[PDB]
Amino acid sequence: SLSPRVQSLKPSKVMVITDLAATLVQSGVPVIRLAAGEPDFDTPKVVAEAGINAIREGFTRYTLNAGITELREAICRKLKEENGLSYAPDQILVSNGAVQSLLQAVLAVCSPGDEVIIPAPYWVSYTEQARLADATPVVIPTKISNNFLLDPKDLESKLTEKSRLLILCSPSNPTGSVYPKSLLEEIARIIAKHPRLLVLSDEIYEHIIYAPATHTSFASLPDMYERTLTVNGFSKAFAMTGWRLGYLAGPKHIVAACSKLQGQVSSGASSIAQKAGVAALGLGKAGGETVAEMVKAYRERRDFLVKSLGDIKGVKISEPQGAFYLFIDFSAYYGSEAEGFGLINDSSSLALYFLDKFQVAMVPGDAFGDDSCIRISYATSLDVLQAAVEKIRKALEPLRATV
Amino acid sequence: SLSPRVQSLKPSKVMVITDLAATLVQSGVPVIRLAAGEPDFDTPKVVAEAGINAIREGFTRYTLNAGITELREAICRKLKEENGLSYAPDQILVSNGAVQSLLQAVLAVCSPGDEVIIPAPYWVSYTEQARLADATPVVIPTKISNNFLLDPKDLESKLTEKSRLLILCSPSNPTGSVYPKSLLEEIARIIAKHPRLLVLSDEIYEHIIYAPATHTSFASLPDMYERTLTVNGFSKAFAMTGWRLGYLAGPKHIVAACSKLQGQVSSGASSIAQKAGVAALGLGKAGGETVAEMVKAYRERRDFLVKSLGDIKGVKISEPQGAFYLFIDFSAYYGSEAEGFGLINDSSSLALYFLDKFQVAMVPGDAFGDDSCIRISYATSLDVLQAAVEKIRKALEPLRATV
């Protein structure tokens, strides 16, 4: 009655839980919302004003399929100034959010049966998008003791003649890990020996990064420009969640194919959002002081959460180097019997315990391929995080941690 | 090097030609743009103001995946008041334009090898979206002498055990034809005898309709509610081209599957556009006097073009009953030798002659499955249409029409 690919598709637990918490709040049940990673900043003033001006001036008509020229040119300038990458404007495809940019890249390059190599913990949609292409996800687990970074030995062990695409998210959602240049250079030398292997570099969290970590675009590495699909966007750095503006930069032939696909599925961004994007890039390098305030706020929220929760017996934390998520290992608590709730034995039941009994919404690690952890978004206020920490502490107090 | 499905996908000639004409104008070459069907009205004042207010009030955060509640509820009210259809709010899925709504419906219901029945002339993307599902387009030509309406005898002759989805666009792009209720009732009786057969009713041009023609939603017909996927949207009726807001209404199980897919591909509409959509539906039944002005303008433009071009020797016109396209049969001119250009022998060469030699951009009928015609959009000013008619007349004057 439904197609196999849509029938077998897993729902996004980020969307399910975020929507559920929003619905609970509306019903009159307060919930601390730490699920979807949503900046609590407004869209910056000059960006919002560019969107308003676009409406006031009637910029509501047809726009070039791949994105307005002024936006693609500004994106090329950003990729050179910030990332050291040289793209022509027809190597940029602007879409309705970076998730659409990612999907079109996967659909364009993966043939049925190709393997898509996905390090876990992975962002929730990577495996499902591979399946939508009729491709095979090949998941490579990573370890909290190695800061959830891909071990190149494990990559070597999973390569086959069918390997087609490696997805690298850095800074990572959900772990907040940042790939150091030296490790990226080692991975690139592996990629270079396999002529069919492409890399999807998901860089949307680029500017949400905590020194001394630094961001290295994969396409800047030796021999990698011609095999890298660079995905970036506006939602996270510029608090543009609801505007929907992302982009792909890559080899001309692949971008041309993604653009042809976009023209037949009408996946473009709104004319209003595109004008707002031009203004966001006009804030200068890395978003200037506007984005710097955000990064400073996220860092102080990170520090508060890591200190507060790292003190709890049994908890294991990889201190994140970017993004605004903690991927916290509460697995020592699995097996606990919570009076009034029941057995807590996996990430789903632990997350449900926090939600149903303490009204704190988080996303279980199984959604990201690692049942040992729970993802907490900290793109919310310090007052809210303080309230959440008190509840998490009280929730774990009557339980027990294995040693 | 590219996936078979993306490699074999045809580019949209509407997008290619519209983008080309826009690029020519920018280079300093004036072009009369009659390709993509783009309202020349601004977005209505109260709709634009709702979008501005959404930005000013910070409505830029996460929104429910399937669309904000106030918009889905308003859509349900519209479907009852205007179309006689009863949907619950969780039977509505709001997306980034109606083209995305259509694609997700096709992907959700068509399994590999299923047949998608598509009357020609068809909108440019119907066959390609079927192919993206690994489904087989089954095209059924129609005839200008029957106002480009599906003959049910031809539908009967093309049904097989693999028939899964019939796509009905009414009012039609590209022909402007309107399916009368009696013909829809005959088609529905055919659908009812085949338990696997669903209908995608593309109703985006609903309000652009010229009395005495009237719009009948397919889901209102006997036995059809449970097999109809109703697609509608805001871009055409409300001059919201650049905003990107469409929706699907249908059986709960199918909408739930499309929503699950949307959550993993992030195909939702912007928060700003959704607030604008609420204001558009607040204009009252059929858009009230705001939309009535548009329909009156489009009708007078239709009448001017039909009268002006219908006078030309050899030209054949089906007077459209809705939408804002003329699908004009200039095929009597095929075989003509245009001095300075060459042989004109098909719709592509005729359209190229008009563009290169007279700077009038139109879309060849082959893009819509019927090489006998060329599509002209008349959602532009009367002064521009007068200029276009003079050029078309001069372009055909030295050529010859078979009899």
PDB file of all heavy atoms in Angstrom, chain B residues 306-336:
ATOM      1  N   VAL B 306      -6.178  35.313 -27.360  1.00  0.00           N
ATOM      2  CA  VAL B 306      -6.931  34.382 -28.194  1.00  0.00           C
ATOM      3  C   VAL B 306      -7.443  35.088 -29.443  1.00  0.00           C
ATOM      4  O   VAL B 306      -7.348  34.561 -30.558  1.00  0.00           O
ATOM      5  CB  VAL B 306      -8.070  33.731 -27.384  1.00  0.00           C
ATOM      6  CG1 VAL B 306      -9.002  32.941 -28.297  1.00  0.00           C
ATOM      7  CG2 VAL B 306      -7.494  32.823 -26.319  1.00  0.00           C
ATOM      8  N   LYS B 307      -7.979  36.300 -29.277  1.00  0.00           N
ATOM      9  CA  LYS B 307      -8.478  37.052 -30.427  1.00  0.00           C
ATOM     10  C   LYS B 307      -7.340  37.428 -31.370  1.00  0.00           C
ATOM     11  O   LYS B 307      -7.470  37.292 -32.592  1.00  0.00           O
ATOM     12  CB  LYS B 307      -9.228  38.299 -29.946  1.00  0.00           C
ATOM     13  CG  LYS B 307      -9.883  39.123 -31.047  1.00  0.00           C
ATOM     14  CD  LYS B 307     -10.598  40.330 -30.460  1.00  0.00           C
ATOM     15  CE  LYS B 307     -11.397  41.082 -31.522  1.00  0.00           C
ATOM     16  NZ  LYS B 307     -11.989  42.338 -30.975  1.00  0.00           N
ATOM     17  N   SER B 308      -6.213  37.895 -30.820  1.00  0.00           N
ATOM     18  CA  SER B 308      -5.106  38.370 -31.652  1.00  0.00           C
ATOM     19  C   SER B 308      -4.454  37.227 -32.420  1.00  0.00           C
ATOM     20  O   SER B 308      -4.203  37.338 -33.628  1.00  0.00           O
ATOM     21  CB  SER B 308      -4.066  39.083 -30.783  1.00  0.00           C
ATOM     22  OG  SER B 308      -4.607  40.221 -30.130  1.00  0.00           O
ATOM     23  N   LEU B 309      -4.171  36.120 -31.737  1.00  0.00           N
ATOM     24  CA  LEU B 309      -3.443  35.024 -32.370  1.00  0.00           C
ATOM     25  C   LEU B 309      -4.365  34.081 -33.130  1.00  0.00           C
ATOM     26  O   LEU B 309      -3.934  33.456 -34.105  1.00  0.00           O
ATOM     27  CB  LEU B 309      -2.636  34.254 -31.321  1.00  0.00           C
ATOM     28  CG  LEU B 309      -1.574  35.068 -30.574  1.00  0.00           C
ATOM     29  CD1 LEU B 309      -0.844  34.203 -29.557  1.00  0.00           C
ATOM     30  CD2 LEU B 309      -0.589  35.704 -31.556  1.00  0.00           C
ATOM     31  N   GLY B 310      -5.631  33.973 -32.720  1.00  0.00           N
ATOM     32  CA  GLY B 310      -6.566  33.121 -33.433  1.00  0.00           C
ATOM     33  C   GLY B 310      -6.868  33.596 -34.835  1.00  0.00           C
ATOM     34  O   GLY B 310      -7.418  32.830 -35.634  1.00  0.00           O
ATOM     35  N   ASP B 311      -6.517  34.841 -35.151  1.00  0.00           N
ATOM     36  CA  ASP B 311      -6.726  35.404 -36.475  1.00  0.00           C
ATOM     37  C   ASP B 311      -5.646  34.994 -37.468  1.00  0.00           C
ATOM     38  O   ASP B 311      -5.829  35.183 -38.675  1.00  0.00           O
ATOM     39  CB  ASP B 311      -6.772  36.931 -36.372  1.00  0.00           C
ATOM     40  CG  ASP B 311      -7.224  37.591 -37.659  1.00  0.00           C
ATOM     41  OD1 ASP B 311      -7.855  36.908 -38.493  1.00  0.00           O
ATOM     42  OD2 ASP B 311      -6.941  38.794 -37.843  1.00  0.00           O
ATOM     43  N   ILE B 312      -4.543  34.427 -36.995  1.00  0.00           N
ATOM     44  CA  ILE B 312      -3.404  34.121 -37.851  1.00  0.00           C
ATOM     45  C   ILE B 312      -3.679  32.827 -38.606  1.00  0.00           C
ATOM     46  O   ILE B 312      -4.152  31.842 -38.028  1.00  0.00           O
ATOM     47  CB  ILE B 312      -2.118  34.035 -37.012  1.00  0.00           C
ATOM     48  CG1 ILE B 312      -1.850  35.386 -36.335  1.00  0.00           C
ATOM     49  CG2 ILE B 312      -0.940  33.599 -37.879  1.00  0.00           C
ATOM     50  CD1 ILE B 312      -0.714  35.365 -35.328  1.00  0.00           C
ATOM     51  N   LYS B 313      -3.398  32.832 -39.910  1.00  0.00           N
ATOM     52  CA  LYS B 313      -3.656  31.660 -40.737  1.00  0.00           C
ATOM     53  C   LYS B 313      -2.961  30.432 -40.162  1.00  0.00           C
ATOM     54  O   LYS B 313      -1.790  30.487 -39.778  1.00  0.00           O
ATOM     55  CB  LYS B 313      -3.155  31.918 -42.162  1.00  0.00           C
ATOM     56  CG  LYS B 313      -3.341  30.743 -43.124  1.00  0.00           C
ATOM     57  CD  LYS B 313      -2.875  31.114 -44.533  1.00  0.00           C
ATOM     58  CE  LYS B 313      -3.149  30.004 -45.545  1.00  0.00           C
ATOM     59  NZ  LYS B 313      -2.213  28.849 -45.411  1.00  0.00           N
ATOM     60  N   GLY B 314      -3.694  29.320 -40.106  1.00  0.00           N
ATOM     61  CA  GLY B 314      -3.151  28.050 -39.680  1.00  0.00           C
ATOM     62  C   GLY B 314      -3.161  27.799 -38.185  1.00  0.00           C
ATOM     63  O   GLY B 314      -3.110  26.636 -37.772  1.00  0.00           O
ATOM     64  N   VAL B 315      -3.228  28.851 -37.364  1.00  0.00           N
ATOM     65  CA  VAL B 315      -3.134  28.693 -35.915  1.00  0.00           C
ATOM     66  C   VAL B 315      -4.398  28.030 -35.386  1.00  0.00           C
ATOM     67  O   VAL B 315      -5.516  28.333 -35.827  1.00  0.00           O
ATOM     68  CB  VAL B 315      -2.889  30.060 -35.255  1.00  0.00           C
ATOM     69  CG1 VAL B 315      -2.999  29.949 -33.738  1.00  0.00           C
ATOM     70  CG2 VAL B 315      -1.523  30.588 -35.631  1.00  0.00           C
ATOM     71  N   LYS B 316      -4.226  27.112 -34.432  1.00  0.00           N
ATOM     72  CA  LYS B 316      -5.337  26.423 -33.788  1.00  0.00           C
ATOM     73  C   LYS B 316      -5.221  26.624 -32.285  1.00  0.00           C
ATOM     74  O   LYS B 316      -4.147  26.421 -31.707  1.00  0.00           O
ATOM     75  CB  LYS B 316      -5.340  24.929 -34.121  1.00  0.00           C
ATOM     76  CG  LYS B 316      -5.718  24.626 -35.567  1.00  0.00           C
ATOM     77  CD  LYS B 316      -5.361  23.202 -35.966  1.00  0.00           C
ATOM     78  CE  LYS B 316      -6.021  22.181 -35.060  1.00  0.00           C
ATOM     79  NZ  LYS B 316      -7.498  22.354 -35.016  1.00  0.00           N
ATOM     80  N   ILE B 317      -6.325  27.025 -31.658  1.00  0.00           N
ATOM     81  CA  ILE B 317      -6.345  27.378 -30.246  1.00  0.00           C
ATOM     82  C   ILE B 317      -7.510  26.674 -29.570  1.00  0.00           C
ATOM     83  O   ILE B 317      -8.637  26.700 -30.076  1.00  0.00           O
ATOM     84  CB  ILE B 317      -6.465  28.901 -30.051  1.00  0.00           C
ATOM     85  CG1 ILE B 317      -5.163  29.592 -30.461  1.00  0.00           C
ATOM     86  CG2 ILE B 317      -6.835  29.223 -28.602  1.00  0.00           C
ATOM     87  CD1 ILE B 317      -5.253  31.101 -30.491  1.00  0.00           C
ATOM     88  N   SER B 318      -7.234  26.043 -28.430  1.00  0.00           N
ATOM     89  CA  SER B 318      -8.271  25.626 -27.497  1.00  0.00           C
ATOM     90  C   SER B 318      -8.408  26.755 -26.483  1.00  0.00           C
ATOM     91  O   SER B 318      -7.469  27.032 -25.727  1.00  0.00           O
ATOM     92  CB  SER B 318      -7.855  24.325 -26.814  1.00  0.00           C
ATOM     93  OG  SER B 318      -8.763  23.961 -25.786  1.00  0.00           O
ATOM     94  N   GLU B 319      -9.551  27.432 -26.488  1.00  0.00           N
ATOM     95  CA  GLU B 319      -9.734  28.552 -25.577  1.00  0.00           C
ATOM     96  C   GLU B 319      -9.695  28.009 -24.160  1.00  0.00           C
ATOM     97  O   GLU B 319     -10.525  27.154 -23.811  1.00  0.00           O
ATOM     98  CB  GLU B 319     -11.069  29.245 -25.810  1.00  0.00           C
ATOM     99  CG  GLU B 319     -11.294  30.446 -24.890  1.00  0.00           C
ATOM    100  CD  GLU B 319     -12.679  31.056 -25.043  1.00  0.00           C
ATOM    101  OE1 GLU B 319     -13.618  30.339 -25.449  1.00  0.00           O
ATOM    102  OE2 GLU B 319     -12.826  32.262 -24.763  1.00  0.00           O
ATOM    103  N   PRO B 320      -8.765  28.445 -23.327  1.00  0.00           N
ATOM    104  CA  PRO B 320      -8.639  27.828 -22.010  1.00  0.00           C
ATOM    105  C   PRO B 320      -9.735  28.295 -21.067  1.00  0.00           C
ATOM    106  O   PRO B 320     -10.212  29.431 -21.123  1.00  0.00           O
ATOM    107  CB  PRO B 320      -7.265  28.297 -21.525  1.00  0.00           C
ATOM    108  CG  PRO B 320      -7.074  29.619 -22.192  1.00  0.00           C
ATOM    109  CD  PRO B 320      -7.771  29.515 -23.539  1.00  0.00           C
ATOM    110  N   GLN B 321     -10.113  27.390 -20.168  1.00  0.00           N
ATOM    111  CA  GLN B 321     -11.132  27.660 -19.170  1.00  0.00           C
ATOM    112  C   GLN B 321     -10.546  28.017 -17.804  1.00  0.00           C
ATOM    113  O   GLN B 321     -11.300  28.398 -16.900  1.00  0.00           O
ATOM    114  CB  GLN B 321     -12.075  26.454 -19.051  1.00  0.00           C
ATOM    115  CG  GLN B 321     -12.655  25.999 -20.406  1.00  0.00           C
ATOM    116  CD  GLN B 321     -11.851  24.872 -21.064  1.00  0.00           C
ATOM    117  OE1 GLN B 321     -11.843  23.732 -20.585  1.00  0.00           O
ATOM    118  NE2 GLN B 321     -11.184  25.187 -22.175  1.00  0.00           N
ATOM    119  N   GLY B 322      -9.225  27.937 -17.650  1.00  0.00           N
ATOM    120  CA  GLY B 322      -8.585  28.294 -16.398  1.00  0.00           C
ATOM    121  C   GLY B 322      -7.085  28.339 -16.597  1.00  0.00           C
ATOM    122  O   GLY B 322      -6.576  28.124 -17.697  1.00  0.00           O
ATOM    123  N   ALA B 323      -6.383  28.618 -15.495  1.00  0.00           N
ATOM    124  CA  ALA B 323      -4.945  28.875 -15.484  1.00  0.00           C
ATOM    125  C   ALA B 323      -4.644  30.095 -16.352  1.00  0.00           C
ATOM    126  O   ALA B 323      -5.564  30.830 -16.731  1.00  0.00           O
ATOM    127  CB  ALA B 323      -4.159  27.635 -15.918  1.00  0.00           C
ATOM    128  N   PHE B 324      -3.369  30.351 -16.628  1.00  0.00           N
ATOM    129  CA  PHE B 324      -2.980  31.520 -17.418  1.00  0.00           C
ATOM    130  C   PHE B 324      -1.979  31.139 -18.500  1.00  0.00           C
ATOM    131  O   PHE B 324      -0.974  31.819 -18.714  1.00  0.00           O
ATOM    132  CB  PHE B 324      -2.572  32.737 -16.573  1.00  0.00           C
ATOM    133  CG  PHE B 324      -1.745  32.418 -15.337  1.00  0.00           C
ATOM    134  CD1 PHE B 324      -0.587  31.670 -15.427  1.00  0.00           C
ATOM    135  CD2 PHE B 324      -2.105  32.942 -14.099  1.00  0.00           C
ATOM    136  CE1 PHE B 324       0.183  31.399 -14.298  1.00  0.00           C
ATOM    137  CE2 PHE B 324      -1.334  32.696 -12.966  1.00  0.00           C
ATOM    138  CZ  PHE B 324      -0.188  31.918 -13.070  1.00  0.00           C
ATOM    139  N   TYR B 325      -2.271  30.044 -19.214  1.00  0.00           N
ATOM    140  CA  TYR B 325      -1.462  29.581 -20.337  1.00  0.00           C
ATOM    141  C   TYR B 325      -2.322  29.386 -21.576  1.00  0.00           C
ATOM    142  O   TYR B 325      -3.458  28.914 -21.489  1.00  0.00           O
ATOM    143  CB  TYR B 325      -0.811  28.233 -20.030  1.00  0.00           C
ATOM    144  CG  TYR B 325      -0.044  28.255 -18.740  1.00  0.00           C
ATOM    145  CD1 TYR B 325      -0.590  27.723 -17.576  1.00  0.00           C
ATOM    146  CD2 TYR B 325       1.217  28.835 -18.670  1.00  0.00           C
ATOM    147  CE1 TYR B 325       0.091  27.769 -16.385  1.00  0.00           C
ATOM    148  CE2 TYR B 325       1.909  28.880 -17.496  1.00  0.00           C
ATOM    149  CZ  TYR B 325       1.346  28.344 -16.350  1.00  0.00           C
ATOM    150  OH  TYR B 325       2.039  28.395 -15.164  1.00  0.00           O
ATOM    151  N   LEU B 326      -1.763  29.721 -22.735  1.00  0.00           N
ATOM    152  CA  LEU B 326      -2.286  29.274 -24.022  1.00  0.00           C
ATOM    153  C   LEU B 326      -1.343  28.208 -24.559  1.00  0.00           C
ATOM    154  O   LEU B 326      -0.121  28.407 -24.575  1.00  0.00           O
ATOM    155  CB  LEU B 326      -2.354  30.424 -25.032  1.00  0.00           C
ATOM    156  CG  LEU B 326      -3.414  31.501 -24.835  1.00  0.00           C
ATOM    157  CD1 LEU B 326      -3.378  32.463 -26.023  1.00  0.00           C
ATOM    158  CD2 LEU B 326      -4.797  30.877 -24.688  1.00  0.00           C
ATOM    159  N   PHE B 327      -1.898  27.083 -24.998  1.00  0.00           N
ATOM    160  CA  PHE B 327      -1.111  26.000 -25.581  1.00  0.00           C
ATOM    161  C   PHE B 327      -1.485  25.990 -27.061  1.00  0.00           C
ATOM    162  O   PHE B 327      -2.464  25.359 -27.463  1.00  0.00           O
ATOM    163  CB  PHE B 327      -1.404  24.672 -24.869  1.00  0.00           C
ATOM    164  CG  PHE B 327      -0.339  23.622 -25.049  1.00  0.00           C
ATOM    165  CD1 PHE B 327       0.949  23.830 -24.566  1.00  0.00           C
ATOM    166  CD2 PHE B 327      -0.632  22.407 -25.643  1.00  0.00           C
ATOM    167  CE1 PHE B 327       1.926  22.858 -24.720  1.00  0.00           C
ATOM    168  CE2 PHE B 327       0.338  21.437 -25.795  1.00  0.00           C
ATOM    169  CZ  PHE B 327       1.615  21.656 -25.321  1.00  0.00           C
ATOM    170  N   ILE B 328      -0.710  26.729 -27.860  1.00  0.00           N
ATOM    171  CA  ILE B 328      -1.109  27.124 -29.212  1.00  0.00           C
ATOM    172  C   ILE B 328      -0.498  26.188 -30.241  1.00  0.00           C
ATOM    173  O   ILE B 328       0.712  25.930 -30.230  1.00  0.00           O
ATOM    174  CB  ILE B 328      -0.712  28.578 -29.508  1.00  0.00           C
ATOM    175  CG1 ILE B 328      -1.372  29.534 -28.515  1.00  0.00           C
ATOM    176  CG2 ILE B 328      -1.075  28.941 -30.954  1.00  0.00           C
ATOM    177  CD1 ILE B 328      -0.961  30.979 -28.713  1.00  0.00           C
ATOM    178  N   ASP B 329      -1.326  25.722 -31.167  1.00  0.00           N
ATOM    179  CA  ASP B 329      -0.892  24.807 -32.217  1.00  0.00           C
ATOM    180  C   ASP B 329      -0.472  25.647 -33.422  1.00  0.00           C
ATOM    181  O   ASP B 329      -1.320  26.140 -34.169  1.00  0.00           O
ATOM    182  CB  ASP B 329      -2.044  23.867 -32.553  1.00  0.00           C
ATOM    183  CG  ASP B 329      -1.691  22.836 -33.608  1.00  0.00           C
ATOM    184  OD1 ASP B 329      -0.827  23.094 -34.478  1.00  0.00           O
ATOM    185  OD2 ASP B 329      -2.329  21.763 -33.592  1.00  0.00           O
ATOM    186  N   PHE B 330       0.848  25.828 -33.582  1.00  0.00           N
ATOM    187  CA  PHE B 330       1.458  26.445 -34.761  1.00  0.00           C
ATOM    188  C   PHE B 330       1.995  25.408 -35.732  1.00  0.00           C
ATOM    189  O   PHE B 330       2.769  25.769 -36.627  1.00  0.00           O
ATOM    190  CB  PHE B 330       2.660  27.322 -34.367  1.00  0.00           C
ATOM    191  CG  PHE B 330       2.339  28.508 -33.498  1.00  0.00           C
ATOM    192  CD1 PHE B 330       2.706  28.516 -32.155  1.00  0.00           C
ATOM    193  CD2 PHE B 330       1.737  29.634 -34.027  1.00  0.00           C
ATOM    194  CE1 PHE B 330       2.443  29.619 -31.355  1.00  0.00           C
ATOM    195  CE2 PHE B 330       1.470  30.738 -33.230  1.00  0.00           C
ATOM    196  CZ  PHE B 330       1.823  30.725 -31.892  1.00  0.00           C
ATOM    197  N   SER B 331       1.628  24.133 -35.568  1.00  0.00           N
ATOM    198  CA  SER B 331       2.257  23.054 -36.333  1.00  0.00           C
ATOM    199  C   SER B 331       2.071  23.184 -37.844  1.00  0.00           C
ATOM    200  O   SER B 331       2.863  22.610 -38.595  1.00  0.00           O
ATOM    201  CB  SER B 331       1.789  21.679 -35.832  1.00  0.00           C
ATOM    202  OG  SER B 331       0.407  21.463 -36.070  1.00  0.00           O
ATOM    203  N   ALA B 332       1.031  23.884 -38.311  1.00  0.00           N
ATOM    204  CA  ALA B 332       0.872  24.102 -39.744  1.00  0.00           C
ATOM    205  C   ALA B 332       2.068  24.823 -40.343  1.00  0.00           C
ATOM    206  O   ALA B 332       2.277  24.754 -41.562  1.00  0.00           O
ATOM    207  CB  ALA B 332      -0.418  24.878 -40.017  1.00  0.00           C
ATOM    208  N   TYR B 333       2.862  25.506 -39.515  1.00  0.00           N
ATOM    209  CA  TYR B 333       4.052  26.206 -39.974  1.00  0.00           C
ATOM    210  C   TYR B 333       5.277  25.311 -40.047  1.00  0.00           C
ATOM    211  O   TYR B 333       6.289  25.726 -40.618  1.00  0.00           O
ATOM    212  CB  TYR B 333       4.341  27.446 -39.111  1.00  0.00           C
ATOM    213  CG  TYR B 333       3.357  28.543 -39.379  1.00  0.00           C
ATOM    214  CD1 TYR B 333       2.162  28.633 -38.671  1.00  0.00           C
ATOM    215  CD2 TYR B 333       3.597  29.472 -40.385  1.00  0.00           C
ATOM    216  CE1 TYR B 333       1.246  29.635 -38.952  1.00  0.00           C
ATOM    217  CE2 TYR B 333       2.699  30.468 -40.657  1.00  0.00           C
ATOM    218  CZ  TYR B 333       1.525  30.553 -39.949  1.00  0.00           C
ATOM    219  OH  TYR B 333       0.636  31.562 -40.262  1.00  0.00           O
ATOM    220  N   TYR B 334       5.209  24.091 -39.518  1.00  0.00           N
ATOM    221  CA  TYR B 334       6.371  23.216 -39.561  1.00  0.00           C
ATOM    222  C   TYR B 334       6.698  22.865 -41.006  1.00  0.00           C
ATOM    223  O   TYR B 334       5.809  22.572 -41.811  1.00  0.00           O
ATOM    224  CB  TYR B 334       6.139  21.944 -38.740  1.00  0.00           C
ATOM    225  CG  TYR B 334       5.969  22.154 -37.244  1.00  0.00           C
ATOM    226  CD1 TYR B 334       5.542  21.118 -36.427  1.00  0.00           C
ATOM    227  CD2 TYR B 334       6.241  23.380 -36.646  1.00  0.00           C
ATOM    228  CE1 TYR B 334       5.390  21.290 -35.066  1.00  0.00           C
ATOM    229  CE2 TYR B 334       6.084  23.563 -35.280  1.00  0.00           C
ATOM    230  CZ  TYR B 334       5.656  22.517 -34.494  1.00  0.00           C
ATOM    231  OH  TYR B 334       5.502  22.706 -33.133  1.00  0.00           O
ATOM    232  N   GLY B 335       7.988  22.897 -41.319  1.00  0.00           N
ATOM    233  CA  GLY B 335       8.483  22.786 -42.670  1.00  0.00           C
ATOM    234  C   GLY B 335       8.910  24.110 -43.267  1.00  0.00           C
ATOM    235  O   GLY B 335       9.657  24.120 -44.250  1.00  0.00           O
ATOM    236  N   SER B 336       8.468  25.225 -42.682  1.00  0.00           N
ATOM    237  CA  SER B 336       8.815  26.542 -43.194  1.00  0.00           C
ATOM    238  C   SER B 336      10.317  26.777 -43.103  1.00  0.00           C
ATOM    239  O   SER B 336      10.975  26.353 -42.147  1.00  0.00           O
ATOM    240  CB  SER B 336       8.112  27.619 -42.370  1.00  0.00           C
ATOM    241  OG  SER B 336       6.710  27.616 -42.578  1.00  0.00           O
TER     242      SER B 336
END
